[PDB]
């Protein structure tokens, strides 16, 4: 199944959105629950840090009106990020650690402008029909225009920090603002907070994996501009390099205006801007975890080995002073003696 | 080379030993220098932490009139550790660690006996010609009788003092007496300390690999009741579990009555009782090394990088709560990311 039947718009005005507009990948899909806010069912999905998709929360009702004009005429006149990339994929890559790996290659390049420039960019690539492809990722602070403070006020402060207390969730570490153009994917990736992933502006098909996928997904090592990203290419995955990735099974829905998304922490994402469904919106909004027991369980997490792993790798880099040598190192301790 | 050519004793009584004497291997070595404790060069070796064979120290002078009948006449009445075994190969089991692994077969049998119970099996053995073997392997304290605490005392404390200030190393931890018999061979192993191998009677084949061939050698897990000892059979190695074993290469020296043998921290030793040559005695020394510098002047030395692999093995043990589940994360952390 996956996705599911689209579902119909109010006053009926078709479907939202058809299969046609979904990439076609190798790997099967189970769905994720769509459910009121007020449903218990879903305050135990969160509570077991399981992914589900909220309906009617309000939480950026104000927000919904947004487009490129309304954004442009009330943003304000300050630096937006502006990611480019000659590709339908948004690679991240940590600047700060380029210069452990030198003959590493970037496919996207940011770009700082203001955002009339954005939107000429679109308006110029469009007319050319170019190849190109564009996506803005800013945080949203004071520095706005007023009437975007408004909005931003006017989102369901009341619901959010409920949740917040409820898990006993760190403070809310920031807000980040997307507006991407159709067809756009960021790839497979996991963060180590926990995310409320608002929707604003046309659909997005969400893929998301358990932590315990971690074998078959093959993140890039920690110290990689690309950590925390699968190496596997979805459209053409080497499947002699990540043998595992055809076992991955993934929990998947399409997210449209008014939606939120609970992207539970170390939870794997795939994002996609449906094809032909013109530009997407959304908001993120990303809390610390709560904090680790005194006392733990045992028979661990799959997300406490997921850190574990991390902290090796960091550990080593440090010891060994130079992060190159994690992996002689590691394949010296395993191989004939582990493996 | 290797051992090279056998020495003359003194008085024309011919040569000490013939290759005939030592079992054969499949790799070169090199051999170990034989120097004079006046010597310079020795001094390097020691300071640098390579082996060498001292001839003149004195160290045990007393002790080369001990044999099995001046021993039971005046060692005491004490229990001695006595090691059992089917074939030629004592191999060391950690009983502590035996919970860990279950399914683990012992191939050597430890037994408590008094002096003269020893050699009465030796002589019980030697009289059916039975293809049993034994080792005793027991720490001289202050129990023993009254002649043997005399010649402990005649040891050079002088010499091996000097070189325990010399080298900064700590305190001596430990003083093992070892009786074999002619054959018997302790497999390749490494100690965490710094040891001065003190030959008494009959002769030993000491074969030794440097820290940086851990990866030819293929240590067990340290969480195994073999941990430190080589996987690999010398005398049948499993190439293709133990490849790089094809490319080890060693030092070797066969040390005599009067001979010091240091073996430094983390050295592999494979140590073998001479065919035919009736039965050895040994005393060894263990120190601690000095300690590691506050500021480390970083190209970590080969035992540096063991010992990060050793801690990181007993960090995961005690993280995951079993020692079992160190290798599948090991595992998971390297396939297709590091390997
Ligand atoms: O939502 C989408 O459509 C795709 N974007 C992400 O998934 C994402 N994920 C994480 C971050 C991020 C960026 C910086 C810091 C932190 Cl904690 C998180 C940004 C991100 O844009
Ligand atoms: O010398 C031989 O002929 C073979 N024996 C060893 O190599 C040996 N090595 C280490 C120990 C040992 C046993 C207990 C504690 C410590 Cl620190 C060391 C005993 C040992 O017997
Ligand atoms: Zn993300
Ligand atoms: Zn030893």
Redesign the pocket.
Known sequence: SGSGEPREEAGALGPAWDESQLRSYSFPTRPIPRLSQSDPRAEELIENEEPVVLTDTNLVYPALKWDLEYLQENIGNGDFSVYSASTHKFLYYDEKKMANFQNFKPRSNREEMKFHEFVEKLQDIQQRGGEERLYL?QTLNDTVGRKIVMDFLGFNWNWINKQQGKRGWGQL??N?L?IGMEGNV?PA?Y?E?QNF?AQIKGY?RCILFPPDQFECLYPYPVHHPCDRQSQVDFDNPDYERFPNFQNVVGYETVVGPGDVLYIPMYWW?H?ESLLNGGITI?V?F?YKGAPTPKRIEYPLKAHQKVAIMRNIEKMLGEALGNPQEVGPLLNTMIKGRYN
């Open positions: 990722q570490t920031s980040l997307l960021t990736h963060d907070q992933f997005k994402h994002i959304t993120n990303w």
